[PDB]
Design a protein around this ligand. Structure first.
Ligand SMILES: *[C@@H]1O[C@H](CO)[C@@H](O[C@@H]2O[C@H](CO)[C@@H](O)[C@H](O)[C@H]2NC(C)=O)[C@H](O)[C@H]1NC(C)=O
Ligand SMILES: *[C@@H]1O[C@H](CO)[C@@H](O[C@@H]2O[C@H](CO)[C@@H](O)[C@H](O)[C@H]2NC(C)=O)[C@H](O)[C@H]1NC(C)=O
Ligand SMILES: *[C@@H]1O[C@H](CO)[C@@H](O)[C@H](O)[C@H]1NC(C)=O
Ligand SMILES: [Ca+2]
Ligand SMILES: [Ca+2]
Length: 590
């Protein structure tokens, strides 16, 4: 491997330290908008709150605690960040014992100015933005009242009482459950599901005997109790609850649960927990109506009701998902699907790695929850086509051994060891740079980076004062070249939070050209087959950045791809026959 020259000089003047020398114990960070560089940092000591604001992607911060009048901010509610570039921020404050209602600091200009607002109620939940209109907010009160605002939280009205759960639907529709006689936990299974399309002026009861409800893609789901039984079933609606269909899914008992694993405009991955405290269930995939379900994966790991699952959307390649399954011997084995759950498969072992014949197993939420030496779950970005990064074990099952970091560049078909120890990682510039920080219980001062998709790595010493590393921060969307390295210095009585923001603009000094990209057929496994690369009835050819090209994709980078319809085979249909949701094959068989 040949390394690019003089990278130290291109990063020293692009390294920016900021110290947060308050006495806080916890730190939370929110990005506000895209292409703004606005970061809000809230530090808490338990109490005192400090509010810091950056507008250069974290290179410099300003103390703006005076903008909230030095009020303690309750971390339970977080920072209610408005969608897209609305620039909306809502912080929930603590009040005294005799206050009639709550207090909230509202900003609509990317945290440049905050307005202090007294509420006619005490908030029980975070204030939720309507996807259709960021001025429309709902919240539940401590008396389980449903409150709605049309003017970004300035004025509130209580549209219904005894509300247990409320969610925005499309076009400013509100769905919510309510109880009549009792409470929310007591009347579990006797709730009613209501809908209002006019922000509380009129109401329609769209369900009774309700356990709970949820939204996923185009689908409205409700679990409904049986008449003379303690079991419950899933009903689904695609017309905002005007009509319902019984999902072709098994019923479950009180000790079981349903969980939406993933949902888009085509279909839903649904987890049905198995009876008993055995920690696993079954994955089913829906049709385009959310009614017909095909069994996709048996013995899917999902510990308890609100427990841990390893289900992972490989967002860098269409149709690819990874998750963990419980073996018959109660060992954990990773499985990968490339066709949206049509079939699952063991992950292919890297060629050079040895078994501790075997396969690759991926560490995710469950491994992290069990306090394994795994700092991050899998990472993928849609604009960085084919790239998957994860901690893994090569062998027969998930192992507690010190895991290596593995990378795929084709969406999970092939794998290679990326780095030796456990590392935090982050993808920048749509894959133009991959960054990694060693996971250690010792202080560190090195950030590793790769410009060839993880094949070659350079180490950069970003500070002479090593830090206990805690996490990476970068602009969501993976289009920036800025990376914030967060850690702390420690004395005998306090911790000094510090961030180092490195700008890679001089590493990727030139913009990528058309010559810098090459054609790549996704899902290619055998060019001799007529249907090579066909997934859900069509294949796609991408323009991928050459690994050898050292250049910036750009903030306005758009993945260039060209689809080609494949002939329909029996693999494109499910049993009602019905074509698979999202399948776009034409001609062929039927
Ligand atoms: C998993 O991740 C992929 C990529 O993020 C999802 O794909 C997209 O679907 C959404 C909404 O349905 C549209 O926002 C995007 O245009 C799609 N993006 C791409 C790159 O395909 C996919 O829907 C997710 N899987 C599931 C089942 O939710
Ligand atoms: C990373 O952060 C830098 C600023 O620290 C970004 O720079 C800016 O460039 C944009 C558009 O060229 C202008 O919005 C801003 O005025 C600049 N910011 C400042 C304060 O100088 C840079 O764009 C980020 N890196 C990437 C690729 O996103
Ligand atoms: C700001 O805080 C000070 C001291 O706590 C208080 O006296 C003042 O009334 C506050 N301003 C408000 C509540 O707007
Ligand atoms: Ca169970
Ligand atoms: Ca490159």
């Amino acid at each position: 491997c040949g390394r690019l020259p003089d990278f130290i000089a291109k990063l020293t003047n692009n390294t920016h330290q900021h110290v947060f020398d308050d006495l806080s114990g916890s730190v939370s960070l929110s990005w506000v908008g895209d292409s703004t560089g606005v970061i809000l940092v809230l530090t808490t000591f338990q109490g005192q709150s400090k509010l810091y604001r950056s507008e250069d992607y974290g290179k410099n911060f300003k103390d703006i605690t005076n903008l909230i009048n030095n009020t303690f901010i309750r971390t339970e509610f977080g920072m209610a960040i408005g969608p897209e570039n609305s620039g909306k921020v809502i912080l929930t404050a603590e009040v005294s014992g005799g206050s009639r209602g709550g207090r909230v600091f509202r900003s609509s200009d990317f945290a440049k100015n905050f307005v202090q607002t007294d509420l006619p109620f005490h908030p029980l939940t975070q204030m939720m933005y309507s996807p259709q209109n960021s001025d429309y907010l709902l919240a539940l009160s401590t008396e389980n009242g449903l409150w709605v605002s049309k003017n970004f939280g300035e004025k509130w009205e209580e549209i219904h009482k005894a509300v247990c759960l409320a969610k925005w639907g499309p076009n400013n529709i509100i769905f919510f459950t309510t109880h009549v006689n009792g409470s929310c936990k007591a009347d579990l299974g006797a709730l009613e599901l209501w809908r209002t399309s006019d922000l509380g002026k009129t109401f329609k009861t769209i369900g009774v005997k309700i356990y709970s409800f949820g939204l996923g893609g185009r689908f409205l789901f409700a679990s409904v109790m049986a008449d003379k039984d303690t079991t419950r079933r899933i009903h689904v609606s695609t017309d905002q609850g005007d009509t319902w269909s019984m999902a072709q899914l098994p019923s479950v008992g009180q000790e079981q649960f349903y969980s939406i694993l993933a949902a888009n405009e085509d279909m839903v991955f649904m987890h049905v927990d198995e009876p008993g405290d055995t920690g696993f269930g079954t994955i089913f995939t829906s049709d385009d109506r959310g009614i017909v379900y095909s069994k996709s994966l048996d013995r899917h790991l999902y510990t308890t009701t609100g427990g841990e699952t390893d289900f992972t959307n490989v967002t860098s390649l269409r149709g690819v998902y990874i998750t963990s399954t419980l073996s018959e011997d109660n060992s954990i084995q990773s499985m990968i699907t490339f066709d949206q759950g049509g079939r699952w498969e063991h992950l292919r072992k890297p060629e050079n790695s040895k078994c501790d014949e075997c396969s690759l197993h991926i560490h995710a939420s469950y491994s992290i929850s069990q306090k394994l030496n795994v700092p991050m779950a899998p990472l993928s970005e849609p604009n960085a086509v084919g790239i998957v990064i994860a901690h893994g074990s090569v062998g027969d099952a998930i192992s507690v051994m010190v895991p290596d970091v593995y990378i795929s560049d084709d969406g999970g078909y092939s794998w290679a060891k990326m780095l030796e120890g456990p590392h935090y990682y982050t993808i920048l510039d749509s894959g133009g740079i991959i960054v990694a920080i060693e996971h250690s219980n010792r202080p560190i001062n090195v950030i590793k980076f790769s410009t060839d998709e993880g094949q070659c790595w350079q180490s950069y010493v970003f500070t002479q004062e090593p830090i206990y590393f805690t996490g990476l921060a970068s602009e969501p969307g993976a289009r920036s070249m800025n990376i914030s390295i967060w850690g702390f210095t420690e004395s005998f009585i306090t911790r000094q939070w510090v961030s180092y923001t490195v700008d890679f603009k001089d590493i990727l000094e030139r913009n990528c050209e058309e010559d810098d990209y090459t054609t790549w057929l996704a899902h290619s496994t055998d060019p001799g087959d007529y249907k090579d690369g066909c997934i859900l009835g069509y294949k796609e050819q991408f323009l991928r950045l050459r690994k050898s090209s050292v250049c910036q994709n750009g903030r306005d980078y758009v993945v260039a791809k060209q689809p080609s319809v494949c002939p329909c085979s029996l693999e494109d249909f499910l049993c009602d026959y019905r074509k698979i949701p999202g399948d776009k094959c034409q001609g062929g068989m039927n």
